[PDB]
């Protein structure tokens, strides 16, 4: 028996609202990967991370899977 949250978090990952967010976070994660390969990156002191785009994705799954999860658990 697999866990009850991760499949539930996978089910709300690929809805219509989630796929506009998990693509939007992935678009941030590509701009990081071309900034992390340019010269002079280690001494740049302004590094864009995608914690804001990850937080929008994680908060959407948090509101959708909060009232539904505890029905699954024994």
């Amino acid at each position: 028996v697999t866990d009850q949250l991760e499949d539930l978090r996978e089910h709300f990952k690929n809805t219509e609202e989630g796929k506009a967010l998990v693509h939007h976070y992935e678009e941030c994660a590509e701009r990081v990967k071309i900034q992390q390969q340019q010269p002079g990156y280690a001494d740049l002191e302004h590094k864009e991370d995608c914690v804001e785009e990850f937080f929008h994705l994680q908060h959407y799954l948090d509101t959708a899977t909060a009232p539904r999860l505890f029905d699954k658990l024994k």
Binding site: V1, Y25, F55
Partner: protein, 248 residues
């Protein structure tokens, strides 16, 4: 503070002891101790919980006199002053795994793992934070975050970098009643147990609270009548003015 320094918000899980009449699920405290003893008893003290508090909550009286005789506490010394040990009893406390603070920071890479006896009431979020902290570990940090070496990411911790790695994987304990021991089942069981460790009065407080708001909202509604009864002479008192003759 940005959103990363503040921590992600802990969502509202539908616990079985929320609401003004629901008690603890005592079948999930007996299964919540077993996740404590076999996962996080290795590195977390539970300093304030006596063994006798578990008798009649989650375990019976014979089960705690065998759970407490595994450990060894200090006895008063013998006839020649040599320090001797003894097996525990019901009146002793749940012992931590580390003999002092510096032995705790030496094992867990500097960071001191906090005592869990009041960790539910000492965190903003409550049970929704302690549950979502354990099930909040991603498989990788978000792209752009460089953690310090030896620290783990989960976003619900304030600041991102926590020093606890993911200690809940599927079927790492085996329950005594055949419940499927997933991570979401196990994190739900400790968080109900650590809520009992923090609030061991949560069953009796919510039934004396029922006995009081019934009386103190029927005493209050009786006193509106006896106020209005004893004020009916002045509430309905009528004045008239016949202006006197100015001859005086």
């Amino acid at each position: 503070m940005t959103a990363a320094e503040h921590g992600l918000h802990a969502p509202a899980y539908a616990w079985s002891h929320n609401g003004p009449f629901e008690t603890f699920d005592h079948a999930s405290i007996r299964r919540g101790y077993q996740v404590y003893r076999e996962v996080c008893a290795a590195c977390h003290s539970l300093d304030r919980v006596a063994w006798r508090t578990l008798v009649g909550v989650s375990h019976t009286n014979e089960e705690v006199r065998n759970m407490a005789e595994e450990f060894e506490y200090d006895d008063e010394p013998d006839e020649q002053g040599n320090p001797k040990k003894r097996p525990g009893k019901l009146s002793d406390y749940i012992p931590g795994p580390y003999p002092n603070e510096q032995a705790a920071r030496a094992a867990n890479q500097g960071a001191l793992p906090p005592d869990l006896s009041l960790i539910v009431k000492a965190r903003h979020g409550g049970c929704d934070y302690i549950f979502s902290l354990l099930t909040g570990y991603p498989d990788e940090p978000p792209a752009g975050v460089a953690l310090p070496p030896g620290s783990n990411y989960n976003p619900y911790f304030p600041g991102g970098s926590i020093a606890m790695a993911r200690v809940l994987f599927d079927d790492m304990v085996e329950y005594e009643d055949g419940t499927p021991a997933t991570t979401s089942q196990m994190a739900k069981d400790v968080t109900t147990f650590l809520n009992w460790c923090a609030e061991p009065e949560h069953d009796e407080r919510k039934r004396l609270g029922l006995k009081t708001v019934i009386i103190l909202s029927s005493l209050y509604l009786l006193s509106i009548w006896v106020k209005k009864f004893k004020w009916a002479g002045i509430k309905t008192r009528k004045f008239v003015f016949n202006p006197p003759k100015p001859r005086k």
